Amino acid sequence: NNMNVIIADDHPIVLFGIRKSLEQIEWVNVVGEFEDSTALINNLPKLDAHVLITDLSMPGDKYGDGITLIKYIKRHFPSLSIIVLTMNNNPAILSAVLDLDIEGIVLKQGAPTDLPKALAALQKGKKFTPE
Template sequence: MDRFEIRVILADDHPGMLAGVKHELASVETLSLVGEAANSTGLMALLETTPCDVLVSDYAMPAGEYGDGVSLFKLINRRYPDIQIVVLTMLDNPAVLHTLVSSGIRCIVSKSDAVTHLIPAIHAARTGGTYYSPTMDGVVRSIDWDVRSRNTAGVLSQRESEVVRLYASGLTVTEIAEQLHRSKKTISTQKTKAMEKLGIARDVDLLRYAMENGLTAAAATAATDAPQE
């Protein structure tokens, strides 16, 4: 009788994290590490030539040809629907986790939790199950799913959503203020309130949230549709 084995590929741009995960996986007989990559370019090339069952991937891997985050995971799901994904990340804000879970990612491990949580996460992913490490479980439980599903931006007001869209399109706070005929202070306050409601602390995470929730696509029409004051 053949031994049960899960073929795993690792993707992370931090060598130290890769080394720690490899060491942990090596101690589990049911897991076989078949490849590793440091960005989406190497990962996609690896997936083309190396059969695997579960991909363990960092959420943020800049500089890759295929991007990162949810857009990368969706691409992988389209090309390789049989591969299950475990996300390993430091990001733990509700907006990012809401986007991940809504896109079908059900196994998420925080880098702030023990790396041992990857083992049950990989096994759960392989069987189509769900696994959140303690930190992620706490955040996921705190999300008001009904509220966030009502509109693209969760609980944002129309004007807050408008500011986020324009900011994600590349405009500065000053430029948004000029375009919407509001004061710079008002725009800054609306942007800050939007980030607070989304549980986002960094501008880069706000941009990522906007891109992954289709807000950037709407940015071009936001100013046209906005009422003039």
């Protein structure tokens, strides 16, 4: 029932909105917030996270962003579920990442409403993908 989530975005107001929304959901606990994928990857093993909710465009020299970062996480944290926050519904972008077998895609600007629904889907072992 309880789900521990990490949220990662290089915009502090995105993290604020997401935390405010998730604080309304009894069974979701935010166990970390990051703005850089190096900090993320460095601290990931230390947090008993179930789901990573992440932007694909953050700073991170060591491990990268986008597809490169996803590949890194899938290999090194293979049971960590991943929800991608996307700035748009670009057909090509989605494809690349959906092929990697991530669990969810949410339009970033709708995250406070849509994340709770994506996380409920995940809890049922189902994927969530924008309309």
